[PDB]
Amino acid sequence: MPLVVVLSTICLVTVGLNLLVLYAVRSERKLHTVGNLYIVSLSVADLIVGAVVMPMNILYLLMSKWSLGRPLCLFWLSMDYVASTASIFSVFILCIDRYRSVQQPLRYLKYRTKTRASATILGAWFLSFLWVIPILGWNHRREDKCETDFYDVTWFKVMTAIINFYLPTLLMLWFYAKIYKAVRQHCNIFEMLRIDEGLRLKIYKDTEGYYTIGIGHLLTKSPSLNAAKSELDKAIGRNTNGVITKDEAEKLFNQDVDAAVRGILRNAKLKPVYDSLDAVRRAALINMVFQMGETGVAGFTNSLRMLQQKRWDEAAVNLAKSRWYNQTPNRAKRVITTFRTGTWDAYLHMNRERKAAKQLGFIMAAFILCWIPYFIFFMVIAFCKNCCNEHLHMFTIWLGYINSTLNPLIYPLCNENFKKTFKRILHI
Numbered sequence: 001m002p003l004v005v006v007l008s009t010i011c012l013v014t015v016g017l018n019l020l021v022l023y024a025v026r027s028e029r030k031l032h033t034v035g036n037l038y039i040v041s042l043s044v045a046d047l048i049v050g051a052v053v054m055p056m057n058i059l060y061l062l063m064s065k066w067s068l069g070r071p072l073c074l075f076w077l078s079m080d081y082v083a084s085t086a087s088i089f090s091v092f093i094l095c096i097d098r099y100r101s102v103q104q105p106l107r108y109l110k111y112r113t114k115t116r117a118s119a120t121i122l123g124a125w126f127l128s129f130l131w132v133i134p135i136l137g138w139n140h141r142r143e144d145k146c147e148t149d150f151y152d153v154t155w156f157k158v159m160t161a162i163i164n165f166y167l168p169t170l171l172m173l174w175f176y177a178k179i180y181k182a183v184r185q186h187c188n189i190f191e192m193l194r195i196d197e198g199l200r201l202k203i204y205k206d207t208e209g210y211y212t213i214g215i216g217h218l219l220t221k222s223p224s225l226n227a228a229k230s231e232l233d234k235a236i237g238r239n240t241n242g243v244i245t246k247d248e249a250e251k252l253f254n255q256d257v258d259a260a261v262r263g264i265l266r267n268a269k270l271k272p273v274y275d276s277l278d279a280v281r282r283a284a285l286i287n288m289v290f291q292m293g294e295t296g297v298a299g300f301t302n303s304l305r306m307l308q309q310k311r312w313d314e315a316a317v318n319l320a321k322s323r324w325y326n327q328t329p330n331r332a333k334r335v336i337t338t339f340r341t342g343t344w345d346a347y348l349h350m351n352r353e354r355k356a357a358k359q360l361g362f363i364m365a366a367f368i369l370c371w372i373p374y375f376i377f378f379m380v381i382a383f384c385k386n387c388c389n390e391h392l393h394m395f396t397i398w399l400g401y402i403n404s405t406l407n408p409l410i411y412p413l414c415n416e417n418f419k420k421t422f423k424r425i426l427h428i
């Protein structure tokens with residue numbers, strides 16, 4: 001009895017939220033992206049669900065029998081099966097794009113364009129609208145819904161379960177496991193200082209007679225190369241001959257990092273900033289210590305306070321005014337960006353793909369979270385003959401209708417251009 005309007009309010013948001021996404025694409029020139037046409041088709045399939053499938057399913061909960069009749073009832077049987085297939089198809093067609101978009105950036109051959117996007121978003125609705133055929137095909141009554149004409153046929157029910165869900169969901173996952181393997185580093189501190197200082201695998205003697213190896217590991221008190229070789233041989237624990245390996249350079253690096261954190265904590269002006277700072281932001285501070293030293297870094301009084309005080313933009317502006325920034329600009333920018341955002345962005349490439357991959361994963365994570373339980377419930381009924389009530393079966397169909405309400409909410413959380421367009425349209 002209280003769940004009459006509960007499912008209705010859910011339907012009320014879906015009619016607008018999906019409509020908002022559809023308006024946002026046509027209104028903004030910044031949202032006219034080729035990969036956003038696949039987000040359009042998914043919002044179309046999810047709107048049909050809100051305006052047609054959702055209100056007609058509320059009536060069956062209020063009035064046990066259908067006030068619909070043959071024309072409305074056969075079309076509702078089509079629009080539920082066509083839109084849900086279109087949803088998995090929009091997702092599978094979107095993932096195939098991101099994959100080729102990741103693999104070949106230079107698809108200036110007419111592949112990342114309307115002529116190739118609209119050709120695959122029209123052809124996807126052809127494989128989805130094929131559902132209207134077995135809706136009128138009896139040539140080959142119950143209390144759950146309008147009745148699918150083949151509800152008794154358990155051999156066909158399992159074949160459409162795989163062809164329309166189990167088959168795409170496995171191929172979709174296979175392709176995504178490949179996308180996630182292409183943009184998967186996410187840096188660390190060794191990788192960060194490798195970008196900034198460089199990794200030398202052979203002892204280098206500079207202009208003032210200084211012996212460097214690895215990620216700028218100086219070989220202290222080495223008058224001659226043989227003294228530097230003998231100190232390095234003691235450190236590494238072998239007869240290197242001035243030549244070390246990446247893994248040795250990393251072992252040595254890891255020592256210098258502990259040595260830097262120990263020194264930071266032995267520092268009065270430093271210890272409070274470091275302690276307040278997160279994982280990545282500590283790396284940006286260690287990085288500075290590695291270039292200027294405990295003493296040099298601790299003479300960054302104002303900025304260090306802004307950092308401690310969690311004023312990231314204030315600090316990023318202040319640090320950008322420093323003499324350090326004027327002298328080493330590209331390192332200072334990468335370090336300052338890291339203090340500003342608290343991310344490894346400055347030390348990573350393909351950030352647009354990286355961002356878009358998290359969004360695709362979020363979309364796929366919703367569609368499997370919403371429909372799986374229902375499809376695994378179909379795996380149950382197939383041989384049991386009704387092992388459970390229609391009190392929970394009514395929820396697994398509505399949880400799938402929850403994905404239709406959930407997807408318009410996903411887009412701004414991951415996409416930046418959507419987040420601002422959604423905020424600007426709400427405050428008119």
Ligand SMILES: CN(C)CC/C=C1\c2ccccc2COc2ccccc21
Nearest residue numbers: 080081084085088160161164165371397
């Ligand atoms: C009642 N309705 C919500 C279920 C129909 C939606 C399906 C489905 C279920 C069983 C057999 C075929 C199909 C059509 O394809 C789908 C694809 C993705 C998600 C749900 C369905």
